[PDB]
Write a protein that binds this ligand. Sequence first.
Ligand SMILES: Nc1ncnc2c1ncn2[C@@H]1O[C@H](COP(=O)(O)OP(=O)(O)OP(=O)(O)OP(=O)(O)OP(=O)(O)OC[C@H]2O[C@@H](n3cnc4c(N)ncnc43)[C@H](O)[C@@H]2O)[C@@H](O)[C@H]1O
Ligand SMILES: [Mg+2]
Ligand SMILES: [Zn+2]
Length: 216
Amino acid sequence: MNLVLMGLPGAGKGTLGERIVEDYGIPHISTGDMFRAAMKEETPLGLEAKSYIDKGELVPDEVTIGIVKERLGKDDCERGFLLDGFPRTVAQAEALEEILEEYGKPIDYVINIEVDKDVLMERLTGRRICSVCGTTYHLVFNPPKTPGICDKDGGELYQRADDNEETVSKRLEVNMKQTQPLLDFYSEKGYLANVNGQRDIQDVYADVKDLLGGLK
Ligand SMILES: Nc1ncnc2c1ncn2[C@@H]1O[C@H](COP(=O)(O)OP(=O)(O)OP(=O)(O)OP(=O)(O)OP(=O)(O)OC[C@H]2O[C@@H](n3cnc4c(N)ncnc43)[C@H](O)[C@@H]2O)[C@@H](O)[C@H]1O
Ligand SMILES: [Mg+2]
Ligand SMILES: [Zn+2]
C-alpha cells in the first residue's frame, strides 16, 4: 500500500492521512511536517527550508527529494507508505519514480483531494493545531470540544505561522501552478484518483478507503 496524497494548501491531506495511518498502519510521511520539525530543532535543514516555508514558496527540489529518498528507505515503510505533500512538482514526481523503482515499491494510487481554491483561505486561517500531537482542528468546521486545547491530550493549540493571509495566498499561488502538470503526469501513468474533498471529513475518508481494498 504505497500512496501519495496531493491537494492544494488546506485541502485536507493531514486530516485524511491521520486517519489512514491509524487504520492501515503505514507511515505518514509529510514533507511539511519534516521541514517543520527541522525548523523547530534548528537543524541545518530546518534553517535552509525556513526561508522558503515562511514565504509560502517551495523548498528546492534537490534537498527535498534527498530527505524523502532517505525516509522511504526506513524499516517502517516495509508494507507501504503514505506520502503527504510530496511530490508537488513534476521533477519531484520523476525523481520519486526512480527512487521507488530502486526500492521496488511503485505507487499504487495518487489521491488528489479536490477542494475549490476559493475556500482554502478559510480552512487555513481558521486552522488550529495541537502543539502536542500535531492533529488539526478548525474553529468552524471541526473545533475542539474545549476551545484552545486538544481533545486527545489536552495540549494547547496554535496557529501555524504560514497560515496568515499573505502567505496562504502565495502558497495557493505556487501550488496551483504545479497542480495540472502533476495531475497530467499521474493520469498518464494510470493511477491518479480524484476525490471530492469538500464534504464532511468521515465522507471524504469513506471514498478514500474505498480505493484502498486489495492493496496488500
Ligand atoms: N514537496 C515539497 N517541495 C517543496 N516544498 C515543500 C514540499 N513539501 C512541503 N514543502 C514546504 O512546506 C510548507 C508547508 O507544507 P505543508 O505542511 O504540506 O503545507 P500544505 O501543503 O499547505 O498543507 P497543509 O498542511 O497546510 O494542509 P493539509 O492539506 O494537510 O490540511 P489539513 O488536513 O490541516 O486541513 C486544513 C484545515 O481544514 C480542516 N478540514 C479538513 N478536512 C476538512 C473537511 N473535509 N471539511 C472542512 N474542513 C476540513 C482542518 O481541520 C484544518 O483546520 C510549504 O509552504 C513549502 O514551503
Ligand atoms: Mg498537513
Ligand atoms: Zn493533541
